[PDB]
């Protein structure tokens, strides 16, 4: 198990670690998070008590380095940094642990939620969507726009999700206009899976990362990407069975984890009604359809 120490907590803040969260008071003796499960990406996120504007946070993998958080009073935020001195880092963590100044990542043993939400998410792919090569961890916030949003304005601060556009030449073969617009199988299988993503795991990893950025930061462009990647599969008549069954699992755990009160801002009525009730795959997502109907029957 790994640890992300905090130098201190000078401003009151709600701290998230994956799907958990806790409040820290101004100048409280808080010095980090321990017992973080090895084997998954993680996200440590922040919303300031005095300014709920800018949710922000950092995607990281403790296998890649030793990371800590320190507040920067000039830029006004908690920053993730890497400690290259291993003995220094171990000494810091051990003292904070001995003084019990750290919260424990509160994973229940029966609980596979985080695995289920991050099954296909890899740090190496995150670092290609979020481009800042000098760090091993990735900053995301509520306001960052996507490459696609920008096309329709600082490129160094964009979310480089794969652009999906159903009325584009990339999606429509000349001479197959009706076919390709009504059945997106070419665009999914040849353009996206074989061409850009190389395999379904990378596709699902980006879909999962988009959902998580939408949920944890309220990042609008991420929500758009998540819905586009769902609709592309559901609007394809020919999808490998293993992908359909995996999608049903992915979406089930995403809908399960979504805060009930954020459904009006995180779920697109058109996309979900189309995917569950009109699309080629309307009968292929049994688990997702059941949770959606029982949890959000109003949306439908």
């Amino acid at each position: 198990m790994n640890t992300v120490p905090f130098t201190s907590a000078p401003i009151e803040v709600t701290i998230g670690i994956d799907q958990y969260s806790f409040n820290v008071k101004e100048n409280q003796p808080f010095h980090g998070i321990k017992d973080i499960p090895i084997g998954h990406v993680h996200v440590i996120h922040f919303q300031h008590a005095d300014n709920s504007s800018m949710r922000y946070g950092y995607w990281f993998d403790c296998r890649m380095g030793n990371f800590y958080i320190q507040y920067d009073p000039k830029d006004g935020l908690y920053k993730m940094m890497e400690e290259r001195d291993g003995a220094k880092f171990e000494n810091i963590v051990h003292n904070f642990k001995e003084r019990q100044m750290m919260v424990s990542y509160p994973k229940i043993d029966e609980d596979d939620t985080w695995y289920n939400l991050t099954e296909f998410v890899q740090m190496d792919k995150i670092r290609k969507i979020v481009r800042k090569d000098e760090n091993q961890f990735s900053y995301v916030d509520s306001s960052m726009t996507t490459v696609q949003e920008n096309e329709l304005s600082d490129p160094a601060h964009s979310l480089n999700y794969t652009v999906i556009n159903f009325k584009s030449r990339e999606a429509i073969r000349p001479g197959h206009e009706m076919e390709d617009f009504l059945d997106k199988s070419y665009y999914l299988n040849t353009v996206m899976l074989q061409g850009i993503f190389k395999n379904s795991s990378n596709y699902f990893g980006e879909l999962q990362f988009a959902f998580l950025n939408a949920m944890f930061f309220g990042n609008y462009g991420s929500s758009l990407q998540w819905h586009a990647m769902i609709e592309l599969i559901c609007s394809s008549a020919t999808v490998p069975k293993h992908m359909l069954d995996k999608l049903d699992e992915i979406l089930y755990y995403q809908i399960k984890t979504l805060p009930e009160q954020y459904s009006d801002i995180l779920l697109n009525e058109r996309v979900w009604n189309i995917c569950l009730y009109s699309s080629f795959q309307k009968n292929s997502l049994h688990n997702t359809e059941k949770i959606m109907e029982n949890k959000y029957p109003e949306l439908l």
């Binding site: 009325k167 584009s168 030449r169 429509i172 206009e177 617009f181």
Partner: protein, 237 residues
């Protein structure tokens, strides 16, 4: 965006534009079968593509063979319309290509946009105007060429005859829409109005009779009377 009453004069400016009406592309008669079921029989149709400034009509005849063995024909008809309009644009010299295409039915928007992806600078627009272009098949010379077609064929016409020698495009379009609205509302009575004087004929090179300016005023008034009369009959007014 959408074309409506506010931006109506735009139809007659110097930016090339075309109206596309697909209402007569897929035409059927419905009938009983020997077993007492119902079946359709397709008849030849047409795409109505009109330049409202110049009166040039590109009448693409849709022969019934294009439906043979095809399913979901009402859906296919929209995509066939878009394919043909796109083909027409590509066939025109660059300086004759439209800058806007206005579809009379909003269901044509996506099919046409998708077929025109190679022309990103050609705006595809809907309209809020209720235009009577479905009544194009009430113009005898247009109906005749559509019905006689034995294969796909593109037929070119000027739907304003020689009117632009004497009136503006705005007035010509208004006259056309009045005539078509009257033919749509009561075809028999409208045709009677247009032919009630044997001495006024349709030139071999024209679609409409050779009325003088004063006779057109009388004809237009009679067409408005017909439309109002039919409104009163319909609503018991």
């Amino acid at each position: 965006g959408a074309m409506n009453s506010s931006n109506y004069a735009e139809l007659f400016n110097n930016d090339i534009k075309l109206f596309v009406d697909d209402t007569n592309v897929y035409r059927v008669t419905v009938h009983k079968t020997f077993e007492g079921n119902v079946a359709t029989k397709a008849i030849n149709g047409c795409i109505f593509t009109l330049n409202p400034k110049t009166g040039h009509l590109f009448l693409k005849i849709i022969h019934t063979s294009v439906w043979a063995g095809q399913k979901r024909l009402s859906q296919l008809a929209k995509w066939k319309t878009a394919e043909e309009v796109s083909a027409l644009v590509r066939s025109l010299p660059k300086e004759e290509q439209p800058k806007q295409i206005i579809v009379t039915r909003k269901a044509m928007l996506d099919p046409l946009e998708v077929h025109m992806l190679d022309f990103p600078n050609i705006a595809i627009r809907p309209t809020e105007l209720r235009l009577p272009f479905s009544a194009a098949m009430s113009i005898d010379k247009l109906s005749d060429v559509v019905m006689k077609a034995t294969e796909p064929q593109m037929v070119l016409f000027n739907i304003y005859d020689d009117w632009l020698d004497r009136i503006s495009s705005y007035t010509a379009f208004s006259r056309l829409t009045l005539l078509l609205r009257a033919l749509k509302t009561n075809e028999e009575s409208a045709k009677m109005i247009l032919l009630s004087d044997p001495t006024i004929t349709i030139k071999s090179y024209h679609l409409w009779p050779s009325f003088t300016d004063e006779q057109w005023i009388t004809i237009e008034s009679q067409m408005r009377d017909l439309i109002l009369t039919e409104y009163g009959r319909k609503y018991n007014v």
